[PDB]
Design a protein around this ligand. Structure first.
Ligand SMILES: CC(=O)N[C@H]1[C@@H](OP(=O)(O)OP(=O)(O)OC[C@H]2O[C@@H](n3ccc(=O)[nH]c3=O)[C@H](O)[C@@H]2O)O[C@H](CO)[C@H](O)[C@@H]1O
Length: 370
């Protein structure tokens, strides 16, 4: 009845875990949102028990990551948790070690994307990938189960004998609030009289930001289109576009936004030229808003978008092919609407958050009384 949700970032708790956490709260359980201080901490803290901790999120310095995970073990023990749900690599691995050193009997892991350590292929990153996968063998062994939001990550980690099928649970996508993301009750943002080509993402190079911006240059307002980017940059980050880049192209930059349903309602299609995903939630949000998607033919994207059904797949690291798929849909409105309609139909029947949350709780029921 004391269930914590550990993440390296409060955004995962607030956007992804939330439906699970709200379901458990409603059932009368005490629910903990464990993540470093961020932009959603204050909001999270009036819905659940917010707990913050110091985390060097990207650092790979052993002593930093050891000291950090010792402090986290203490922070976690003070919560007297019955079960901990972790998410993503650093929480899955070091969060599990910390949780077990803290006396938490049950730890459920979650993989929602393999990350940039499977995009980059340099020798340094290949070494880091090997260590992480070696530690996963241990954390997965100490943990009781791991949920996977797509099939490819599960297949892969199984193929590498990192985890036994017995513990693999496949719950496709983290779900989307299809009653909130509902065209009929949403008033579009006013972005003009243009065909808005919308990309929602943190400005990671590995999200395809460069390709989205080059594709904007290539189409250059074709058929009265306008590329729009929603998300945050970060200065002094090799892995990220700075605001100067995000504002300096044939793209309208809106920064961070909370009116995503309204922005999607204003848009003509959603683009996600990611280098790698798990089950992208912005794609789900577009589908729920009955909007067609053009996404990269990469892990995750190619499970959330079926080419010719709810969207079009384009080659990765290829600004011209991304522009081509967008042009195709600009050239054929009746097709673009048909794909969006298929997206809305697919999400309502398989990806509404409420049933997805109930399936997580059925996994928890295996170990604790809810
Ligand atoms: C592996 C990877 O690279 N990403 C995965 C990771 O999500 P990411 O961390 O990549 O986030 P995402 O891009 O899937 O989702 C972003 C979330 O933030 C919201 N948002 C974003 C920007 C903004 O200004 N305002 C706003 O509200 C957006 O509506 C969405 O709900 O986990 C997700 C949940 O499973 C998916 O599996 C993604 O594939």
């Amino acid at each position: 009845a004391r269930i914590g949700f550990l993440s390296h970032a409060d955004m995962s708790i607030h956007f992804f875990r939330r439906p699970i956490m709200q379901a458990l709260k409603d059932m009368g359980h005490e629910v903990f949102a464990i993540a470093p201080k961020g932009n959603f901490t204050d909001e999270l803290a009036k819905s659940f028990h917010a707990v913050t901790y110091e985390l060097d999120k990207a650092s790979l310095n052993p002593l930093t990551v050891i000291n950090n995970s010792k402090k986290l073990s203490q922070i976690l023990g003070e919560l007297n948790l019955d079960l901990l749900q972790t998410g993503a690599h650093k929480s899955n691995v070091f969060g599990t070690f910390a949780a077990k050193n803290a006396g938490i009997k049950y730890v459920i892991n979650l993989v929602e994307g393999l990350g940039s350590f499977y995009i980059d292929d340099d020798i340094k990153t290949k070494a880091v990938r090997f260590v992480m996968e070696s530690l996963y063998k241990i954390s997965f062994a100490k943990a009781d189960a791991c949920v996977f939001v797509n099939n490819s990550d599960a297949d892969y980690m199984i193929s590498k004998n990192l985890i036994d099928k017995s513990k693999v649970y496949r719950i496709k996508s983290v779900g989307v609030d299809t009653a909130k993301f509902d065209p009929a009750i949403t008033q579009a943002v006013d972005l003009g009289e243009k065909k808005v080509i919308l990309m929602i993402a943190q400005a990671m190079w590995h999200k395809g930001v460069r390709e989205f911006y080059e594709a904007a240059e290539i189409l250059n307002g074709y058929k009265n289109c306008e590329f729009v980017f929603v998300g945050e940059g970060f200065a002094g980050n090799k892995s990220t576009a700075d605001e100067s880049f995000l504002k300096g192209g044939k793209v309208r930059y809106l920064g961070a936004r909370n009116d995503i349903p309204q922005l999607l309602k204003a848009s003509y299609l959603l683009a996600l030229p990611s280098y790698k995903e798990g089950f992208p939630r912005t794609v789900l949000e577009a589908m729920s808003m009955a909007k067609a998607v053009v996404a990269s033919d990469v892990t995750g994207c190619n499970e959330a978008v079926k080419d010719g059904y709810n969207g079009l797949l384009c080659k990765v690291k290829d600004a011209n092919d991304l522009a081509g798929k967008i042009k195709i849909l600009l050239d054929d409105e009746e097709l673009c609407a048909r794909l969006g309609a298929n997206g809305r139909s697919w999400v309502v029947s398989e990806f509404d958050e409420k049933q997805i949350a109930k399936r997580y709780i059925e996994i928890y029921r295996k170990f604790i009384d809810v």
